[PDB]
């Protein structure tokens, strides 16, 4: 019972596939103080862009 002979061959059969890399990650895993700040900054940035678009 137990051996590791075939497992590496079985592993590379379908490659050692990397996880998909996305542009934005979740603001989870981040500091709660930082995360709530970024909400307020992003909320104001969205408002600022919309007002600038409306006035231009």
């Amino acid at each position: 019972n137990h051996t590791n002979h075939n497992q590496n061959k079985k592993a590379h059969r379908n490659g050692i596939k990397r996880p998909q890399k996305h542009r934005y990650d979740s603001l989870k895993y981040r500091d709660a103080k930082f995360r709530r700040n970024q909400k307020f900054a992003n909320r104001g940035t969205v408002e600022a862009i919309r007002q600038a678009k409306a006035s231009a």
Binding site: A11, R13, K17, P19, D25
Partner: protein, 159 residues
């Protein structure tokens, strides 16, 4: 049979260097780490708080979170047939900047510079590194360097 403790078989990995024991250098705390920075994990045995697992010693990853006294590092760990993202909260005592990323950044600065003067002069600039080319043809002068003839030496008994 094994014992599967967190610090098992870390006798030599977490050991302090010879004549490098004692107080930790203070410059470690004065370096700023930002998200996206490349850092090399090297566990310091003196600080037993915030230690990563013995797998992450010698691994390099990208910082994703910066905390009061710690850094969040993103490592990819081989689990069977895939890569898994491992997010290790490791204190800055066990973290150092990767000189490779610096060197890349300085090379990027140089490449942008060479591109600027190339466009200013109207010429094209070679920016891609090349592997070492085969040796070129060159002359070798024997003046005051007359070749000496060598013969293999006979066997001798010298213990």
């Amino acid at each position: 049979p094994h014992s599967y403790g967190i610090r098992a078989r870390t006798r030599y990995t977490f050991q302090r260097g010879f004549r490098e024991h004692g107080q930790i250098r203070l410059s470690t705390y004065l370096k700023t780490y930002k998200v996206g920075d490349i850092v090399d994990i090297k566990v310091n045995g003196a600080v037993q708080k915030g230690m990563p697992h013995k797998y992450y010693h010698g691994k390099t990853g990208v910082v994703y979170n910066v905390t009061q006294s710690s850094v969040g590092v993103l490592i990819y760990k081989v689990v069977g047939n895939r890569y898994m993202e491992k997010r290790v909260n490791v204190r800055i005592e066990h973290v150092k900047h990767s000189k490779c990323r610096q060197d890349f950044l300085d090379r990027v600065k140089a490449n942008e510079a060479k591109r600027k003067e190339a466009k200013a002069q109207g010429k094209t600039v070679q920016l891609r590194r090349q592997p070492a080319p085969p040796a070129k043809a060159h002359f070798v002068s024997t003046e005051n360097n007359e070749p000496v003839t060598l013969h293999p030496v006979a066997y001798d008994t010298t213990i």
